Amino acid sequence: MEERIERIKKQLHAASYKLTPQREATVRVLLENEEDHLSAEDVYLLVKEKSPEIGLATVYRTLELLSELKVVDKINFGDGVSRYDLRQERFHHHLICTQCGAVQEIQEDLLGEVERKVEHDWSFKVKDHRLTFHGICKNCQEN
Amino acid sequence: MEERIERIKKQLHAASYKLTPQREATVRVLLENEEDHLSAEDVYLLVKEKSPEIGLATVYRTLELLSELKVVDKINFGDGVSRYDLRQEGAQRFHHHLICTQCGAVQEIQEDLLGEVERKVEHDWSFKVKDHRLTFHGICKNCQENETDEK
Ligand SMILES: [Mg+2]
Ligand SMILES: [Zn+2]
Numbered sequence: 001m002e003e004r005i006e007r008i009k010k011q012l013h014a015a016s017y018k019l020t021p022q023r024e025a026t027v028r029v030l031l032e033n034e035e036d037h038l039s040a041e042d043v044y045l046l047v048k049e050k051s052p053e054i055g056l057a058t059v060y061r062t063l064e065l066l067s068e069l070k071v072v073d074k075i076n077f078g079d080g081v082s083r084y085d086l087r088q089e090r091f092h093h094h095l096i097c098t099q100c101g102a103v104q105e106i107q108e109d110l111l112g113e114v115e116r117k118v119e120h121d122w123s124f125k126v127k128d129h130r131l132t133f134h135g136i137c138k139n140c141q142e143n
Numbered sequence: 144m145e146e147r148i149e150r151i152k153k154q155l156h157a158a159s160y161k162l163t164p165q166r167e168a169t170v171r172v173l174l175e176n177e178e179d180h181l182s183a184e185d186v187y188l189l190v191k192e193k194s195p196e197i198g199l200a201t202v203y204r205t206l207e208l209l210s211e212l213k214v215v216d217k218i219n220f221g222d223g224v225s226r227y228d229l230r231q232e233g234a235q236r237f238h239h240h241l242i243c244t245q246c247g248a249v250q251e252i253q254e255d256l257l258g259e260v261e262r263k264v265e266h267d268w269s270f271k272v273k274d275h276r277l278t279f280h281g282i283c284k285n286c287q288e289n290e291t292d293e294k
């Protein structure tokens with residue numbers, strides 16, 4: 001058992017960096033969309049646009065492996081879906097449509113006035129800030 | 144077929160006022176600790192302190208259903224742990240947080256400081272905002288004055 005512990009160990013560790021081309025495909029779809037903030041639905045459907053023998057559960061397990069091993073980050077921005085964004089590694093803003101899933105980054109920094117107010121009001125030294133907005137987007141208001 | 148669906152409807156209604164006791168157990172733990180932001184694991188522990196004939200799956204499934212219903216909100220903090228944040232009742236926008244990147248204090252902000260800004264994004268990007276999630280990161284008030292006793 002004591003060495004069976006070991007056998008299993010090296011099984012698991014192998015399973016973590018040894019990448020099947022099934023896993024490798026989920027990674028391809030991540031690298032091919034860095035700015036984009038992809039859901040499990042998303043990464044799935046795009047893996048099928050090259051290798052559709054894949055299986056959704058495979059795609060999920062792979063993502064869930066990456067996020068453990070701090071290569072991607074699960075995030076919930078509050079649209080009620082966990083999104084897997086890579087960490088190639090003020091942070092920008094997001095508008096996330098709670099229907100058509102349309103993301104839009106805001107390049108500007110609209111906080112300013114708020115950032116300062118906080119500081120005064122709480123005696124807090126701001127360094128970084130991450131804002132996400134929820135609302136069915138321009139195009140869905142017309143379709 | 145539509146008969147079978149109605150049957151299924153009656154099925155679930157039973158299961159539900161069958162299952163509410165373990166629902167109430169979990170909703171307690173949340174309410175008792177609104178200042179904390181509990182991970183599912185956390186809840187689980189606190190619920191066997193009263194109702195340990197519970198099992199973990201029924202707690203999670205409750206937690207998820209409750210964030211389905213906006214009653215609570217799932218939140219990572221950079222610590223790679225999904226945590227269930229209770230929304231103050233009747234609120235229209237989720238609270239803000241100040242996180243400390245050191246000591247790790249978390250301050251819910253009950254006011255809504257993004258009003259003028261909501262109005263700007265709604266304008267500039269022809270968007271219809273229905274909620275938001277704002278978080279700041281920064282060494283907090285007391286960590287300014289306890290690393291002025293450590294240099
Ligand atoms: Mg700023
Ligand atoms: Zn973004």
Ligand SMILES: [Zn+2]
Nearest residue numbers: 097100102137
């Ligand atoms: Zn949209």
Ligand SMILES: [Zn+2]
Nearest residue numbers: 180228240251
């Ligand atoms: Zn909170």
Ligand SMILES: [Zn+2]
Nearest residue numbers: 243246283286
């Ligand atoms: Zn602090």
